[PDB]
Design a protein around this ligand. Structure first.
Ligand SMILES: *[C@@H]1O[C@H](CO)[C@@H](O)[C@H](O)[C@H]1NC(C)=O
Ligand SMILES: O=C(O)CN(CC(=O)O)CC(=O)O
Ligand SMILES: [Bi+3]
Ligand SMILES: [Fe+3]
Length: 679
């Protein structure tokens, strides 16, 4: 072990004093092979951000506004440790900015113009920056000076700390706009009282503000929340009806070489020795020198930020949109009004080439973005860099936990009424070679497995779910001797059978030849003992239908299916010999893009679907015909979902529990990140 010092950045002489006490008390209880603190004193939060980027410091705790500023070039900082504020069993790392109104006041979010508004204070986050950022494009021009545009948007307001001389209407509800607690409508409790008293029609406040100023649910039922989709929901449903979800206080560090593990090691040790009510000699969350030095006085401890989290993901799509609007002070030109370009997310260069062709044929209505993993693509849809992609049910689940919604299903059964007929799903199966007569589902231990990719339905969740129920541990790489399960940790025995070159080895994309249904079947033919795939994989790749050299000579009847009862059946007897049902793949998008995506794709499939006779020369959306590029190759159409518009309602209770039973065996860094934000 070499250097274990975290250089903490302080922003004032008082912080610098507390940091020094922090270093001293840690040196007295932590041994020499443990973490230590060093203190660098700067003059502002921005100077700390700059110093960290320039490798002169390592850590500083920031409000969300500065976490945003810290992420921008050329700082490139990321969140690494979170302060939490509730119980250790119910940590409250985030608040929810909300718009509270009285029940039955008869207006939605898109009708806030002409209303009386209550704010916590000018330039405050929940009470100003967030709602004003979100309303920005609805404000009348000129939008700056901002206070003037807002004063013209609302009929009257309380905005503490605002200039009452230049902008009198901002003070109508609190004459003088007193920047202090002597004003009854100042701050969180004050802005809520402004609403409670009938002075304002809407208060912009934290979700916690309501819960701490009202005794009861009966009290809370007298109020409502404004949702971004122009509906109202009960106050208790703030998780589903907020303006933005916002981290309270975040330790940030360099994106590269930032010492995140050491920063957590330090802070995890500090909260154990000197955290809430732990020590009398030193307190992490108080000080004789003042409030909120280094960390907030209301903090109860720290939680580690999941590694896959970047600032955009951490702050959330809603918060980023608001702050960008305010920071750059410029609007895209309304109306216009048009949905047009859906940005499709393609998985690496193989999918990107089919997507490119689609884009040119769609004539402006489809555009393309690339990422190297499904999870990177899902992250791109979350942050707004992409809008849609099709997904295996396993990744529909992950996407759903990440707040995405299914809009249309891939359908596989040919029918005169494809678009309007929901399918129960395909079958997950375990394929083996007939000549390998020994193999039974009863004992697959010490054998070699081939999987579409980790996290996928037929390739992973179903069979590994069933395996986990039998052996009751997650070490599937010890159960099997070796295999190919693309997406596995690189030193895992479940990467040893994969065929990709160099850095492509075991990657979950088509640069890895054993990725996906066809690839998993190839793996079985060449190296493996069992393949976990869909029921149609074998016939799609046998009898000369796959013309590639490895598949050319393969016969359907040389393969069998493993049944659950320990017997074997031929390939076409999948209906009586399968592991489980598998919900169809589906297109997912942001809740705010659901309608435009639904519209565009229905139009798109009408032009490039199954209606096209000659698929040579004309563009076909549903053909690869080997690698399931963009959509599965056996896709007949994209089907309506009607009310099956959430991941839980789409996938069904049966498959949702199954994946949840595997929650402990999850290597998915994206899922860890999403469930940290929404547990
Ligand atoms: C699709 O497949 C199922 C089961 O194989 C079959 O019963 C059904 O008739 C097919 N048609 C439709 C429209 O789902
Ligand atoms: O609103 C602000 O500007 C102050 N801080 C936190 C605080 O001081 O409570 C940002 C926030 O509320 O996220
Ligand atoms: Bi605040
Ligand atoms: Fe699948």
């Amino acid at each position: 072990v070499p250097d274990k010092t975290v250089r903490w950045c302080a922003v004032s002489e008082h912080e610098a004093t507390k940091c020094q006490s922090f270093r001293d008390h840690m040196k007295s209880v932590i041994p020499s092979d443990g973490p230590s603190v060093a203190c660098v004193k700067k003059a502002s939060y921005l100077d700390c951000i700059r110093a960290i980027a320039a490798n002169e410091a390592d850590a500083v705790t920031l409000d969300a506004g500065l976490v945003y500023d810290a992420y921008l070039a050329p700082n490139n900082l990321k969140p690494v440790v979170a302060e939490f504020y509730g119980s250790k069993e119910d940590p409250q790392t985030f608040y929810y900015a909300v718009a509270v109104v009285k029940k039955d006041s008869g207006f939605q979010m898109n009708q806030l113009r002409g209303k009386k508004s209550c704010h916590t204070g000018l330039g405050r986050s929940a009470g100003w920056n967030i709602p004003i950022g979100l309303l920005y494009c609805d404000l009348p021009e000129p939008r700056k000076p901002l206070e003037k545009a807002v004063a013209n948007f609302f009929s009257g307001s309380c905005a503490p700390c605002a200039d009452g001389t230049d902008f009198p209407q901002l003070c109508q509800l609190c004459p003088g706009c007193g920047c202090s607690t002597l004003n009854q409508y100042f701050g969180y409790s004050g802005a809520f009282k402004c609403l409670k008293d009938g002075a304002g029609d809407v208060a912009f406040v934290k979700h916690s503000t309501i819960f701490e100023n009202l005794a009861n649910k009966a009290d809370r039922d007298q109020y409502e929340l404004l949702c971004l989709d122009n509906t109202r929901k009960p106050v208790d449903e703030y998780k589903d009806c907020h303006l933005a979800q916002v981290p309270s206080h975040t330790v940030v560090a360099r994106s590269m070489g930032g010492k995140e593990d050491l920063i957590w090691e330090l802070l995890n040790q500090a909260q154990e020795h000197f955290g809430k009510d732990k020590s009398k000699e030193f307190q992490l969350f108080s000080s004789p020198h003042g409030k909120d030095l280094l960390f907030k006085d209301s903090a109860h401890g720290f939680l580690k930020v999941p590694p896959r989290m970047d600032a955009k993901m951490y702050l959330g799509y809603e918060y980023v949109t608001a702050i960008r609007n305010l920071r750059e002070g410029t609007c895209p030109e309304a109306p216009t009004d048009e949905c047009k370009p859906v940005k499709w997310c393609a998985l690496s260069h193989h999918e990107r080439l089919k997507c490119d062709e689609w884009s040119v044929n769609s004539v402006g209505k489809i555009e393309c973005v690339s990422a190297e993993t499904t999870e990177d693509c899902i992250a791109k849809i979350m942050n707004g860099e992409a809008d849609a992609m099709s997904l295996d049910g396993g990744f529909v689940y992950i996407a759903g936990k990440c707040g995405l919604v299914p809009v249309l299903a891939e359908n596989y059964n040919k029918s005169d009424n494809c678009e309007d007929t929901p399918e129960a799903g395909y079958f997950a199966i375990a394929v083996v070679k007939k000549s390998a007569s020994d193999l039974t589902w009863d004992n697959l231990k010490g054998k070699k497995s081939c999987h579409t990719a980790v996290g996928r339905t037929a390739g992973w969740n179903i069979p590994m779910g069933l395996l986990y129920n039998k052996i009751n541990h997650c070490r599937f790489d010890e159960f099997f001797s070796e295999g190919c399960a693309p997406g596995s940790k690189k030193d895992s025995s479940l990467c040893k059978l994969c065929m990709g070159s160099g850095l492509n080895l075991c990657e979950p994309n088509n640069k890895e030849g054993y990725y996906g249904y066809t690839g998993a079947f190839r793996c079985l033919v060449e190296k493996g003992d069992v393949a976990f795939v869909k029921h149609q994989t074998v016939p799609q790749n046998t009898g000369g239908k796959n013309p590639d050299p490895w598949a050319k000579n393969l016969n359907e009847k040389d393969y069998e299916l493993l049944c659950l009862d320990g017997t074997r059946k031929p390939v076409e007897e999948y209906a009586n010999c399968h592991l489980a049902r598998a919900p169809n793949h589906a297109v997912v998008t942001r809740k705010d893009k659901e309608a435009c995506v639904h519209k565009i794709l229905r139009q798109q499939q009408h032009l490039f679907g199954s209606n096209v006779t000659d698929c040579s020369g004309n563009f076909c959306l549903f053909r690869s015909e080997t690698k399931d590029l963009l959509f599965r190759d056996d896709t007949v159409c994209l089907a309506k979902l009607h009310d099956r518009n959430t991941y839980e309602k789409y996938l069904g209770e049966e498959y949702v529990k199954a994946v949840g039973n595997l929650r402990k065996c999850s290597t998915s860094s994206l899922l860890e990140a999403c469930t940290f934000r929404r547990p």
